[PDB]
Symmetry: C4
Subunit: 387 residues, 4 copies
């Protein structure tokens, strides 16, 4: 039967490590796909780790150009959480260089975008097969979440973006029951930009903390109602959470407009807590090093910069990167509330390191109502490989 | 319980990519069987990719002579769609260098032909074991579909051919419930030739688009009724769909007789649409390069050459090859109609390339009611391998 | 629920190939256990291939001494029929250098013998764990079937031998419900010898065609009743079926006494057909080359040498070896009778070939009521390996 | 539904080999994790082998420093008993360099401790996800069982230790239903020390045979009641069972105080039998060589040194090491009593051997009411590896 996911998010004080896959380290000798954009989604029987292969394996000649971002070889697959993206445990999901996924209690729903950049198409899947499609509507990279979409009482919603990586673009929400689309919406956000949102269910509504790739060093936020009515803005916080980003002291929070002088970013996330918010980010303000998460007092509703809880999961001497959200189903956590969790992508090799390849590993952290000590659960691989 | 498969085929406007396995690319380092003749069949829980191994793996000394077509080592196996034909996820089906397969809602039914060429035998399997057999009846390669057979309301039917690859041969239809044969038929087609049919269910009857290897550059078509009464001919179309084949301008369609001056071919397919038809084919008229599919107006009932929908899934700079059909069960697509899909085999190495081996990869496309943009989702492997 | 297996054996006219694993060929590059003594047993959901690893893999330094027969490393494992004995699909059964196995409709029952030769012990397993044991009772290699034991209406019976490989030894039957022994019997056979029986169910009684390693070039036969009352002798046939063995022309059949001047043998099998019998054997009378099976008219009840059905599954230019029996459950074949099948072990490397290792592959043939043409489905490996 | 596990332990006369994994031997060529601290726990469907990887595989550069004990890479995983800890069959449990696990009839419960040593944290898991946590409470390695915890009628209990490896430390018991903690206890044991207990269910109470790392060459024992009331002491026996340990002749048993002049040890176990006890141990009193188990008459209640049953499972010419307990569920053994079993860890390479790596293999022995002959089922690997 169907999953409700209508409870608010639980109020945690810290996150405990769920898993760690050791994708890369294990790949020096194992048969592991070369990937990127990994994320985590859960059903009422298990959580799985979805990723985007490069139709190749680590420590092999085919892992060469693996930095480009797109190719016809990129395919969306998955494996039980914590397990590495190896070839022998992989479940084929779909053909994509940009995906998202979520389960609604009964079956999984996947969306893999692939094809030419001026005419890419999104193949929606449900129950082991594609059921519906969405063609690029602005002829210019029809991307998406690169993270767990969201299902509430049977209806699963997600976000998509067609446009430049810089200047203004076009966004849209998507709502669908059992793999068949059922209406969507065009996000009005002139001057504001949005990409790869790390959503999650909360209070019977969908909340996302996306990524402005145009001008914002602060992230845009967006609450989606079931009838497609929505709200869009930016984490109010007085602290920046993008990368690259200006300093905490030189940044002024903003609930409606983007801020900071930076035209590039990185996927990221944030959880709503009362009017408070837990916001993740890479410690090193310029590169993709280390990963830290912060709970600014009142941050979701005020421009607050009042900190009172900080914990590192990746120190600044370790490659980090992407990081999305998702929740544990009540049919697993057992809580009376949606336990919030997130993952951290730990990229390696190019661009940052001298290697002919690029890939990443992931680490899964999870709510809990106990303050967790700072530590580093970094990749570990010894670069370069048998290159 | 049993599957009906009595609904007509849905009327699509284009096909969206279901999966891609990256068999070869992944094999440069992985443990993947060396194969050929792959295809796709689906049950009410999943679609699987069936293939014919060579009892060996890529990038190994045993992948040597792998071009011959037949050996006692060739065995029919399968893996969830999109997954590569690796050794660790393979499901043993049967011993064969020529197979077909289909599920009837409850269990799978496989038929693997193997043995000497003048006395080969077909072992029929059902539920993990052989139940019935069919011995060669003309002492001369007892081949078959090399594609998904067809089950309607419990009875599964398929096609077989015993004879020369050229001059006239002997064909026969086959109908069977739960793995036990139950009557069959000899196809009368003097002057006309048939091999490896890419059938599918439609309107409570079975339709196949086979391959004349004798003289036809246009494919033969055949509608099988449940009582074994049938119809046999050639796609009426005024456009050739075999390889090698003469030009579109120099070809005259034919609903009853084969045409064109060519004594060799390749497996292929076609879907009925009203009186219209979607016909697949390799773009390059002589070699096994690129793959394109066309919807000629009225083509299934008239000698029409009226085009009004063309989409490439493999441009002409990429090795292609075989391509068969099959349908998605209503217990998966959810449609009220049999969603039509097909796969494309992408061969590599010998004969076309300087390698001691030969194998292929596959790509799965699927109905949908949206016109899909042209693209190439080609093999990708870097030949030669660690040869 | 429980399996009856009380129906007679079906009367076939030939056997069709079920599967072929390509263990060795695939091992040149794959991760396959180095094994020996493989066999086949089936439950009402699937047949599996049981074997004895050497706690090592092909094409590795540990596959060295792998000829000895016994070590503390030898462990009994299995994999779906036709699948190779690779490490990633293997199911651990038990610790042994001599096993047997069978399912009784509900769970599997395994018996792995291991330990010192003068005090070896048999660990009986049932449902994923050992339930009962049988200690060596004559301090001298406590071996067993090396083939599928037999279960009838819940009670599973098998055979064991403690003694020299030559001169007289001690045998015993074993009957047990759900993994717990329940009485057994000492076979009286002075002058007669018995080892590794290839039994099967028939007419509510158990029939085995074992191996005299002392003096018989003809095999001993033994019918086990449910109350442990039994019958013991030798295939009556006027044709020898052991290896080494004297010529067909110089052999005189014998229903009660062993015959021929040979003190060594090989595992083998035979099926009862009316008073007729299908008897398997290696074609080459001295070595372990080729495999043939024969249906001598009346052979099971008379000293007959009347042949009228012969089919080779391995020509005499191909290494062969062991071969045991077993039946397909009615809950799989669908027949109203126990379809008889058997497997053929194809050994390689030492002793016969110049290699530091020894192992084998298997081939599964199965009843059917159609006369099957002679062919060779031999190993295939290219020796030596990356040695 | 829930598991009772309230029956006493069965009274065996010997233990029969359940399985053997051949982890290391197989790893010379296979893809096996490099591990340590392996153990065995069982549910009412199967027993599984839990271990602690090093986020790497054997015969690879990453298996280097693998001796340290702790890293952020260490993750707790498992595989069906007897199966090696290979990457393709591994089930991710949690992130840890110190774990324990047990099933309560419905789902599994795992606890993985990881993080800094002065602030480590324990993530409790249940049903594929962490549900509750326990932070280090003495800032100094928050370790645990490294063996199967214990569940009785739904409530699962285990033991933890925070302190120095030498001088006095702090212990505590833990009781929890469905992954959520529910009260615990601080063990009062001044002068006495406890670590990595090898518990098991017996008489509706929990009994553990731990390891004093401070001063005891005799092991401490502890009976846990359901209301957390408990008893703590040392195996009464007049024979030492730790390593290093003084001689049997120079040792005087002790039911309340530790004895012997040794400040280091090794994990170990013991089973209660009447007032008798089966105690395991490494034969060689100083190193980690061989493994033997002894049943001293009355040993659990008296300082007895009365032996009358000894059996070796690893002779003193073979590396051995850790060894924990656990029981077979009645829903598997079928007995009316909790069949007692245990495993033996066979370490290899560093520190004892000249290798850049360290890891181990395991062997599983199991109750039974038959006296089992002495033998060696040692590792087998040929060191060094392709180093
Ligand atoms: C479709 C595509 O190529 N998406 C890109 C993404 C995108 O480039 C930016 O979001 C700007 O729009 O950037 C990044 C990135 O790491 O910055 C990875 C993505 N790679 C993949 N999703 N495969
Ligand atoms: C049984 C057999 O050898 N079949 C051949 C097939 C056949 O040769 C032609 O259809 C003419 O009859 O050709 C081809 C081919 O690629 O042209 C592949 C097949 N290989 C395999 N099915 N293994
Ligand atoms: C227990 C044992 O070592 N059994 C031997 C077996 C036996 O040697 C003869 O049957 C004489 O008794 O011979 C053979 C053989 O191939 O001749 C293989 C067996 N190897 C294994 N079962 N592992
Ligand atoms: C947490 C930790 O590092 N535990 C150590 C353990 C400990 O060191 C002693 O018990 C003293 O407290 O010793 C040993 C050991 O083999 O002596 C292995 C353990 N390694 C692992 N559990 N990973």
């Amino acid at each position: 039967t169907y999953m409700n996911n209508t409870e608010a998010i639980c109020d945690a004080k810290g996150f405990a490590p769920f898993s760690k896959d050791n994708g890369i380290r294990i790949g020096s000798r194992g048969h592991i796909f070369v990937i990127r954009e990994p994320f985590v989604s859960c059903s009422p029987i298990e959580c799985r780790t979805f990723f985007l292969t490069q139709g190749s394996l680590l420590n092999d000649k085919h892992s060469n150009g693996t930095v480009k971002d797109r190719s016809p070889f990129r395919t969306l697959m998955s494996v039980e959480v914590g397990q590495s993206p190896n070839v022998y445990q992989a479940r084929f999901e779909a053909v994509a260089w940009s995906a998202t996924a979520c389960h609604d209690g009964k079956k999984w729903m996947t969306v893999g975008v692939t094809g030419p950049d001026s005419k890419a198409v999104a193949v929606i899947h449900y129950g082991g097969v594609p059921t519906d499609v969405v063609n690029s509507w602005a002829g210019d990279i029809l991307r998406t979440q690169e993270s767990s979409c969201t299902c509430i009482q049977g209806d699963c919603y997600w976000v998509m973006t067609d446009g430049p990586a810089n200047r203004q673009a076009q966004y849209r929400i998507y709502k669908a029951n059992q793999g068949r689309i059922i209406g969507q919406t065009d996000i009005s956000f002139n001057g504001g930009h949005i990409e790869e949102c790390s959503c999650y269910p909360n209070d019977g509504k969908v909340e996302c903390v996306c990524r402005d790739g145009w001008t914002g060093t602060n992230r845009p936020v967006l609450v989606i109602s079931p009838d497609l009515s929505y709200r869009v803005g930016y984490l109010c916080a007085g602290i920046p959470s993008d990368t690259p980003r200006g300093e905490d002291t030189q940044f002024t929070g903003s609930c409606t407009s983007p801020m900071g002088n930076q035209g590039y970013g990185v996927k990221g996330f944030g959880f709503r807590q009362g009017t408070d918010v837990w916001m993740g980010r890479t410690i090193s303000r310029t590169s993709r090093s280390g990963f830290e998460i912060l709970r600014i007092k009142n941050g979701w509703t005020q421009t607050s910069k009042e900190q009172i809880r900080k914990q590192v999961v990746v120190d600044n001497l370790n490659w980090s990167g992407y990081s999305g959200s998702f929740t544990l189903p009540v049919e697993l956590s057992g809580k009376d509330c949606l336990v919030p969790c997130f993952w951290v992508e730990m990229i390696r090799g190019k661009p940052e390191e001298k290697t002919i390849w690029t890939s990443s590993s992931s680490i899964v952290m999870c709510g809990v109502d106990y303050e967790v000590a700072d530590w580093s659960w970094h990749d570990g691989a010894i670069l370069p490989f048998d290159i």
